Every structure is written in C-alpha cells, then in structure tokens.
Sequence to fold (1188 residues):
Amino acid sequence: DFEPVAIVGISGRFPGAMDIDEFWKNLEEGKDSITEVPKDRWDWREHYGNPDTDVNKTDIKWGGFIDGVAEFDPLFFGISPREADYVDPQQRLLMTYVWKALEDAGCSPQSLSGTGTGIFIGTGNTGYKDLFHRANLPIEGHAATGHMIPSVGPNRMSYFLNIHGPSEPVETAXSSSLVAIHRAVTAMQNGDCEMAIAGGVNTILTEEAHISYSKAGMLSTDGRCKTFSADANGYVRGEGVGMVMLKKLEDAERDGNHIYGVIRGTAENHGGRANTLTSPNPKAQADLLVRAYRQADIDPSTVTYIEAHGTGTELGDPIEINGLKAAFKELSNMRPDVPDHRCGIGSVKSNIGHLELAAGISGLIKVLLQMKHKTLVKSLHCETLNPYLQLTDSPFYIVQEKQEWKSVTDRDGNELPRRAGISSFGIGGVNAHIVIEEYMPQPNVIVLSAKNKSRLIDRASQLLEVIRNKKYTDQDLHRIAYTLQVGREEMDERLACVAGTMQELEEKLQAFVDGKFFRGQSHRNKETQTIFTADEDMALALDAWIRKRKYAKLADLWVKGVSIQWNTLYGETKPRLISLPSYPFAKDHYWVPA
Amino acid sequence: DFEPVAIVGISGRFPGAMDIDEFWKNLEEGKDSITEVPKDRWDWREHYGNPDTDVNKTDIKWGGFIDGVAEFDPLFFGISPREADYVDPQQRLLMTYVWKALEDAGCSPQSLSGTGTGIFIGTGNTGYKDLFHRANLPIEGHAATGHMIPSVGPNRMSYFLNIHGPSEPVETAXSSSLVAIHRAVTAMQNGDCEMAIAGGVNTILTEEAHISYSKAGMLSTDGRCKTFSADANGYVRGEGVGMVMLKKLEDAERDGNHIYGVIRGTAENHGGRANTLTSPNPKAQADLLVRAYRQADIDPSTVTYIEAHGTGTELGDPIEINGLKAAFKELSNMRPDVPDHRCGIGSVKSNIGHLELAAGISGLIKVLLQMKHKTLVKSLHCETLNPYLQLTDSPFYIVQEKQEWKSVTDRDGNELPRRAGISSFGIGGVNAHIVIEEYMPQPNVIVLSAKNKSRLIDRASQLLEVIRNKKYTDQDLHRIAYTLQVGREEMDERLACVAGTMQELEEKLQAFVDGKFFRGQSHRNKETQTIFTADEDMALALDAWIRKRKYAKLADLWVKGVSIQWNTLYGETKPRLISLPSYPFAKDHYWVPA
Fold:
C-alpha cells in the first residue's frame, strides 16, 4: 504494498464558518452553529405542523446553513453571467473550493494541465431544478448541463483544469465524501491517476427534504445532533463543502509539499441484510474497521482518536460504539506495543449538524485540524452519556471536554505520530473508514496577482489580515515568497514588493491597500515583453539579475508580464510550500431567473 | 499483473426486445425499434412546436421505449404493494434484472449471502419524483428511500442479497454503465470485492429531458441514430436496462461457470480542455484506447471488431474514428503477428437509440452475442458513409451488411480467439473503453420452484418454449439438470420429474401446464421434513437413494422440502453450468398514486 497518500491541500465552508480558520475557531471554542431556517430558503412557519398527522407539514425548523450559497464568479471560470443562473450551486461551490484547495496546496493550475489528475466529489441533485418548476420558468437548453446532470459538476472542473484523470460524482448518501476519498486513494494505487482532488458539497435549497425526512423519523425535534447523549433523538441537517488535495506521499516529499497528514489505509463495504433497510450493522462496521487497520498495518493501541459517524440517534450511537469495540478487540488477537490504551471519540455533527453528502469531509477536516493544534475539541450536547455505550472496559471515552492530544510512546521508549480514524455511514448501508497518521517532517520578492484590480486588492487584504494575526513569523518569509512565486497562477493584474522582514512586507501591503511597491498589467505591456523576449543574451542578463539579487528590477519586469525563473533564486532544495490565503472570488449573486 | 475477468451471466430489456434472445433476433434481422412517443408517457402533440422559437416545445416525437416500465413484483423482494408506488422504476428495474443476471449465471442467492459481492449500476434521477409534483401529491416519508436518493437502488439489492461488497450508483452521463464495468473490474483487482454485478438502467418518464436536449441541439430531428452516415444529425433517446455478472476468470473455470467472454483490459479517463464543454476529444480517446490495450497486452492487429460509442452526430462520428486510427497506429509502433489487419466498426445505437445511462451495457451485450453466434450484424442507416471518415488506409470498415465474424490466424498458423472493444463517452467528457476476448473452453431429476403456483406455471412454460425452439439437445440434459439443482433458489412451490431425453422432459412439462411428475409445497410438509430430519442413519439412507439412483423417490421427497445433496449425483468434475430462463416476475402495475 500500500502506497501511503499525502493530504497536501484543504479548503471548505461550514455552518458558522466562512473558511477553515474560522472553522477551527468554532471547534476549539465549542461553538454550536445550528440555527433556525433562514427566510432566504423558505418560511418554516408556512410549513409548520405535526408531521405524523398533517399534510406537507414538519415540526423541524432548524438546520446548519452556510453563507453565500448563491455567490459565484462566473467570469473567472469562463461562464457567462446569463448561464450562471442555470448552473446548480452544487457545481458552482464545487469549482470554487476545488480551486481554493489547489491554491492552499500551492499547486499551480499550469502544473496540472495535461496531467492525469482525478476528481471525486460527493454530490447530487439537491433541488435546484425544483426551484425552476416552482417559478414556472420555461425549459431551456442551458438546463441540460446546468442542473439536470450532476456529473457535469466534476466534469466541468476537469474541463477547466485540463486534467485527464477520472472525474466522478460520488453518491452513496451520507457516506459519499468519504467513499470519494476511498475511491481517490484506490485510483492512485492502480495507475488510474497520479494526483486527485476529493470532497463533498451539500446544499439545502427546498423544504421537501426536511418534510420527507421528518415524516420518516430521521430528524431531531430538538434540532440538535446530541451524539453519545442520553437524549439523542435524531439528527439535524446541514449545508457545507469540503475539499482535499491528494498526492502520493513520496511525491509530496520530493516536490516539497506541506502535508496535513498521511492516509495509511481506507475501506469501503456494505452492511448487507440488516434489521431494516436503513438499520446500521455493527458486524459490518467491525469488519470495515479491521480491513482498514490491517491495510494500514498499525497497532490498534496506537490509535488515540476516532471521529465517529455519530449522527445522534437512539440506537445508532451504541451500534457504532459496539462496532468499534469488536473491531479493536479482533485486531488485538490478530497480532502489544503500548499498555493502557486510551482512545477518544467525538463527532463534528454536534457542532455543525449532519452535512450528509459533505459529512465525511467535515469529519476529516476536523481531525486534520486537531493534529495541527494537537488538541481534541469538545463534543457537544453529551454532558449525560447514553447508558448503553458501556465504555468501562474498553480503550474508548467520549471527548466531553477540550483537552491536549497526547502522543503515545514506544516500547522502545519514544514518541509515536498521532493516529486517528474517521467513519461515515450511509442510510442505504454503504460504510467507509479512513485511517490518518500525523506527518513527521535574505530579502525576497513577494508577488501577487489576480483577474482584476478589485480581486488584487482583496488578495492583498487577505495576506495583510493573516500577517497582523501573527500566523507567520520572519522565519516563514522565504516559504511565503516561494509559494507565491511558483504556487500561484500568474494572472493579469499584478503587484510586487521587496521585503526582508514580516514588518516591512506588512507596511508595503498596507500602503497599497490605503491607495498610495511595483504595479502593472500583463496585457498592456506587449512592448516591454517584446523587448525582453526569449533571446540568448537576454537569458544571460536575467540570470545575472537573479544571481546578483537585483530584486527591485526583477520585480518591475514581472508586473509587466515578463517571465522570471524564480526557481533559480534558490539552491537544490527549495523552500517547502506553505498554506496561504486562496483566491477571494467575487461574491456576486446568481439564482433562479425572474 | 492484470487478472482477467469472466462474464458469467447476463440479462436485459431493450426497445423492441423483451429479453436477450429477442434482442439478438432484432440485431441479426437488422430491425429498427425506434418508435413514436407512446401516449403512456406523454402526448407528443401537446408539446409540438419549433424548439428554437417556441416556449416549452420540441419537434422530437421519437424514442426507443421498452415494455413494462411500471411492472414490478414487490412481494418477491419483501416490499409492500403500497410502498411499491413510491419506489423509482429505476430501482425496481434494477432489482429485477440483477436477479435475472444471477439466475442466468446459475448462481444461487444462497451462495452469495455473506460474500463480498459488489454492485455497480449506471443509474440516476430520471424524473419519477417530478411526476409526484405534477400530480400534486402529498410529501410522504416513503419518498426518502423511495425516489429521492438514487443510491438506494443498488443498496436495496445489496440488502436483499445480503452482500457486503461496495454498492454504488455510477453516474458519468452517457458513459455510466461502462465506467461501472471499469469500476467493478478495478474493485475485483484490489480486493474490495471478489465478485460483482454491473450494468445500467435508463428510463424516460417525463418530456422535460426531450425538450431541454432538443433546445441544446443534441437530438435528431429525424429521430434516428444514423451513425457513420452522411446524414448524421443528432441522436435519438432510448430506455433500457442491462446487467452482467463478473467473476475472476480462474474462479469461473474452477466453479464450472459458463463464460460469455473475458474482460482483458479496461480504461477510464477525462477529455480535459476540449473545444467546448460538450465537445469530444480525439487525443483523449486515443490515449484511452492505448492504455486499455496496453493493459490487455494484445496485438492490435488481432482486434477484429469495435463497438463504437457512435451516437450519430455531425462531428462526433469522425472524431471517434480519428481517435481509433491514432490509437492503433501508436500501438503498432510500441511493439506484427497478423498481416492485412481488418477491423469492423458498428453501433447498436442505430438499432435501439441512445440508452444513455444504459448505453455502455447495450454495446457490450451486443458484442457478447456477436461472439456467441460468430456474426457481425448490420449497422443501420449508413448506406451512404460520412465522407470525413477516411478509412481507406486503415484497418477499419463500417459493418454495412451482416456477415460472418471470421477469426484471424497466428504467425504460427492457427486460430486466435475473437477480440473486440467497446467505447462509451459522456457529454461531460468522461471516457471508458473495455476489451473483450472470446472464451475458449443417464436419466436425471429436473427440478423447478417458485414463490407461488402462478409463477411455477410460468417457469414451466418458459422451459417448455425454449425446448420446443430446439435451443438445447439431449447433450445438454445433465447440464440443465445440474443448473436447476444447484443454481436456483429452492422456493416454496415445487415441481419435479424424471427424464432421460429432451423429448420425455417436454412431455412431462406439457402435462403439468395442461393441468393434468411430482408436485408439492415446502411449507406444508413440516411433518415429512421432521421425519426426514438430519439423522446419521437417515444420511446413509439418502446417500444410498442417490447412489442407487432412485430418482423418483428422491424427487418426491424434494418437492416436500427435504434437502437433497444433488452434488453427490456427479463425479469430481460437475457438469458446467448452462444459461436457462430466469424468473418470470409478476407483471403487476405500480405507478404514481391517485
């Protein structure tokens, strides 16, 4: 054999969280982002009633909603504004956060073009087409690729990125975005592709799903996923989108990627004949886990955290726990390098609700963040545990309070990397499990570019705000410079400044934002580009400009669109890539036509 | 490494074709099954008009429709009649033809229970839910698993069969059921599952798809897929369902399966940045083919037939041909064991239209039948070839007339197995290709059983009609007997008769159908079953009954529900399984409630 996979880039938007940073902020602080259904979507009052006796009524007025579900920047993607009204927000959000995940990795689209890169996204029809019917709008040809065929989403981005790997929507209900990971890893092992992007997108656009699920007995009448609690009585629905970029580990180490964590094993199965169609199967879950850790070949006593599927139902939570206990017990007999095993269990659903198609990727992202800050955040609404869990004689405990994620120790007597598992189960019975292992590893020119002046200003403000918040030190200057130099598409509106410290850079960015560095437009300097064309002695001159570190002169040429081999500023081993703010797309509104 | 996969069972229903037999009948006779839209679905007159100028109108009144899209036998599958109204016909047809494919293989559900068998079906939302909205029906809890979540289809059958392999819907538009094959083969190579069922289901339930596709310029205003023709001007839409059972080749040879053909290589890619989003890419198609045949490791000059994607468009057909020419030319340079290479090209779409989700599986089934009858059937509507094909200096020719499929010869001087390729492309740019290689290999008790008396009579009539039509000889008696003995679920209503020739069997079946053999009900002989319980001396008695070939006595016990070890009637090497009529499900109508 199994070739471990590196997670080298992430992006996302969750309830109460605009980005990954604000998402971790909420988790660490134990925030609950479940709200009442906004009038934006529908009026919960107009559909209120007893679901068991009233026609088309539900008592569920809650959900985890995200901001800007209608926000899109169609011109960035070569889509006209008129056509953007017909494109399903499922696809719009998909394209946006795939790009963001690429930038977060520091992988330039140029580098991707022509490659066998795959895309596997949890997505499906979430009701956008129904809004067209309600509005009594004419059927148009735009609808075909617009919002009638869900696979157009991933396919649209493969077209845009010019990649040739498999491009699939994954739809296995609530396990979708985790099966997507499994499918991606699988595709990388067998040669189908070399790199991959995976994740999920989930949107709640009509009240129909709320009403049917309510009448089927799935939804909590409290509107909270009270996982592991004694009061667990159903789940609460949430919107969201998550993306991860995957590269083979050894490729990621050669290419100088920054790594969030390493996928060591994955597994996918089906529950077979259970009690009913929608009943979970503990035997199937235990077999799932065994296969995953057998493939990872890790001692089960090293796994210190489990992200449970944990939806917050009456008999769902104990069954999952039972599967866990049976799995580890079996893995112990099969092969004891850490005494007194203790493993925490939590569920991100207590914070943001059940993201369904995007549920799996929300779980993974939470775990990756926990590894970064070495903290196990609190699981919500479970002050009183379900008495049927019975964790007394097991390594497991619910993470009821925020705490340090302690690394366990060898029999040889030294620190092991943190290891964790995520589980996602569908109501149809499709189960997926993934095993994550923690990864164990003078002035310059700071360049920025964007499609237009407004976007360029937004890029500068983002870099500014992230610097003021001390998220970087002077130590990270050359990494930030290198990542912007080679890990960003060179767009038309450009900005460059020379800096040696974090303080100098902050001042020159602030000066630019204030409205007072080098500035230019690539398309309006065809004269200059013609002068600095490819010539053999020109190449010597540029090389000397680089060798003698004439940064201000190199920078002024660059903002005019002159190609600079930034690679030669550095020795054999380039600085390792670093996570920087991704593109600030225009927040323009596109929805159902008049 | 590559482990070749055996196709050991098939089933299906296509326009103008109730089953596989009638499907081959149509192909051999060059029948065109495209008809006008039946009043059953919608009134084409009520939506007629100029698509380019008229609101909600289309000039397309044609399509390839199948019979009994509303027919289901819910009690067979443990589904109540009331719930059957809410289950999408996509799922209903799925369950039906998965079972039929299993029976065709001679694989008993008992043998499947507990195994890691996967299910990968081309399916999606085709508009059943929209019929509920039109009818202004109340939202019910049944809808969730009924017709709102497409993955419930495959998952429902995995539940029913008690299998634990991956259970996914595959939706990559028009390449779906071929990607499904690819996904299945892939899952069998990497240990995800040991056996798999793959295929596609496509249904046309509302006029919406017709109108949008028409306004988008996809549909032929002649209503015919005139592939390779000079008159090619779009495709025609068709309904259908196809299923294949897949086993690892060496497992199929050990288990005594009958084999339709061997999958030697598969490939899946994406077209990347093409001319437009929906434009095909010849370079991507050529790379697809190269990978497939490189994996199959077969000399390209041995491939004598290609089932083109062949949709019948203006620039689609030449682009596909160009991809083929470039692919083979490249495969030649890479490594010449048959001089004067000639390879035929055809498209089943000329016969039945474009089955979309089920398009790929229709192509494969056509090819498998062609291998069985050693015949390349006529491609329709192409008396005048597209002048842009340019096949003069290539191995390729359109199969314009029915002809014998000649097997090519070695450089060593002897016959090679027939080899062929199927291609399926999606409008989103997802491409799949599969490489098939032809497979090169005294009275008894005939038992039959079913859920009820009516179904048992139907089973007997099917066996009767297939015997009268000389589809078997006396040579196949022990194979037919063995397949019914071990390759059928033992159901409640039973029928048994002793026979030594095909004539004797036909008479006793006819006698049963006439209303005049052994007969019984398993659930009403608990007394007899108690007497013939498991006892150690009872085992000796039954064994002697088998050894001394007391067939009439064994048969009378069997119809009363007494377990008979039919395995011991035969030596070490059992008779090879044989394709027999599959279950004749009740043709009861279930549709949108009042």
